[PDB]
Amino acid sequence: KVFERCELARTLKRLGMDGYRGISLANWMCLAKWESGYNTRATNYNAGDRSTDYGIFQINSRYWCNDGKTPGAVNACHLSCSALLQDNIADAVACAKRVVRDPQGIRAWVAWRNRCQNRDVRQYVQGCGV
Ligand SMILES: [Cl-]
Ligand SMILES: [Cl-]
Ligand SMILES: [Cl-]
């Protein structure tokens, strides 16, 4: 599914993302926006290293979820990458929380550095009731 902006904001808030390990909801919104356009079903193959990015946060198979087909990979979220292509984003949120328990936090995603870091991200949550 492709979430509408405010629907997603509220969905993430219910799932405990607001301020998780210091990360505001608007940061999570900015991440989802630029990773996937708020689209849960997106996959992107990285021909360079044979990994794939999955779902609304474009979580990578090398480190985070198992797809069977990524060489040398591990699965720190202990999920099938299939779990990250559901309309229901509970598993994707749990895995995003796992990512940001590591030292880099939200810097783990390069798109966040490029598109969100050091920016005014207030617009992502404007009017959403969050
Ligand atoms: Cl911030
Ligand atoms: Cl699973
Ligand atoms: Cl689903």
Curated annotation (Swiss-Prot):
It is an enzyme of class 3 (hydrolase). The active site is at E35, D53. Disulfide bonds join C6-C128, C30-C116, C65-C81, C77-C95. InterPro entries: Glyco_hydro_22, Glyco_hydro_22_CS, Glyco_hydro_22_lys, Lysozyme-like_dom_sf. One of its GO terms (molecular function) is identical protein binding. The keyword DNA-binding does not apply. The keyword Glycosyltransferase does not apply. CDD domains: LYZ_C. One of its GO terms (biological process) is defense response to Gram-positive bacterium. It catalyses: Hydrolysis of (1->4)-beta-linkages between N-acetylmuramic acid and N-acetyl-D-glucosamine residues in a peptidoglycan and between N-acetyl-D-glucosamine residues in chitodextrins. Pfam families: Lys. Its EC number is 3.2.1.17. GO terms for cellular component: azurophil granule lumen; extracellular exosome; extracellular region; extracellular space; specific granule lumen; tertiary granule lumen. Keywords: Amyloid, Amyloidosis, Antimicrobial, Bacteriolytic enzyme, Disease variant, Disulfide bond, Glycosidase, Hydrolase, Secreted, Signal. It is found in: Secreted. Residues 1-130 form the C-type lysozyme domain. It is linked to Amyloidosis, hereditary systemic 5: A form of hereditary systemic amyloidosis, a disorder characterized by amyloid deposition in multiple tissues resulting in a wide clinical spectrum. AMYLD5 primarily affects the viscera, and the predominant clinical features are renal dysfunction of varying severity, and intra-abdominal bleeding. Inheritance is autosomal dominant. Belongs to the glycosyl hydrolase 22 family. Monomer. Lysozyme C is capable of both hydrolysis and transglycosylation; it also shows a slight esterase activity. It acts rapidly on both peptide-substituted and unsubstituted peptidoglycan, and slowly on chitin oligosaccharides. Lysozymes have primarily a bacteriolytic function; those in tissues and body fluids are associated with the monocyte-macrophage system and enhance the activity of immunoagents. This is Lysozyme C. It comes from Homo sapiens (Human). The gene is LYZ.
